[PDB]
Design a binder for this molecule. Structure first.
Ligand SMILES: O=C(Nc1ccccc1)Nc1cccnc1
Length: 150
């Protein structure tokens, strides 16, 4: 009973979380997942500020109200070569990665690793935070509050 959560640098408190190496998070799960990091789904304004500080990914993820990809450098296989906060408009499907926003993180680029999951609750899952540099932090718990996400 294991969940891997790959996380990134934080940029103005915003970071990306990919679960189990696949698009696999629902909007309800995303809010619960960010809550386990004492975080919330970013607002568009928070995401735009993070982008301005150097944040980009090549993965769709929830923010508050939309599913987006922050892009700095045009890449044909990331958000159709767009720059800025690219907003997904048309999709059949409901599961993506998520972004999260931690107000207590540093104001600009924070590329230190994540070494805790401070607000997970008691539960049976081995949850492993996987940093981009491969460093890991694991703890037994749960973060999902909606049965349909389990
Ligand atoms: O904030 C964190 N831990 C913590 C919380 C309160 C007091 C002391 C430590 N971890 C974290 C979360 C989201 C992104 N990066 C790091």
């Amino acid at each position: 009973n294991q969940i891997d959560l790959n996380v990134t640098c934080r940029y103005a408190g915003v970071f990306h979380v990919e679960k189990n190496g696949r698009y696999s998070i629902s909007r309800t799960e995303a809010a619960d997942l960010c809550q386990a990091f004492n975080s919330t789904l970013p607002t568009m304004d928070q995401m735009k500020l993070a982008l301005s500080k150097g944040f980009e990914t090549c993965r769709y993820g929830f923010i508050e109200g939309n599913v987006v990809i922050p892009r700095i450098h045009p890449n044909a296989i990331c958000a159709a070569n767009h720059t800025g906060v690219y907003i997904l408009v048309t999709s059949n499907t409901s599961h993506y990665d998520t972004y999260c926003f931690n107000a207590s993180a540093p104001p600009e680029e924070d590329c230190t690793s994540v070494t805790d999951l401070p607000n997970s609750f008691d539960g049976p899952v081995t949850i492993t935070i996987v940093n981009r540099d491969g460093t890991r932090y694991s703890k037994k718990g749960e973060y999902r509050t909606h049965q349909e996400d389990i």
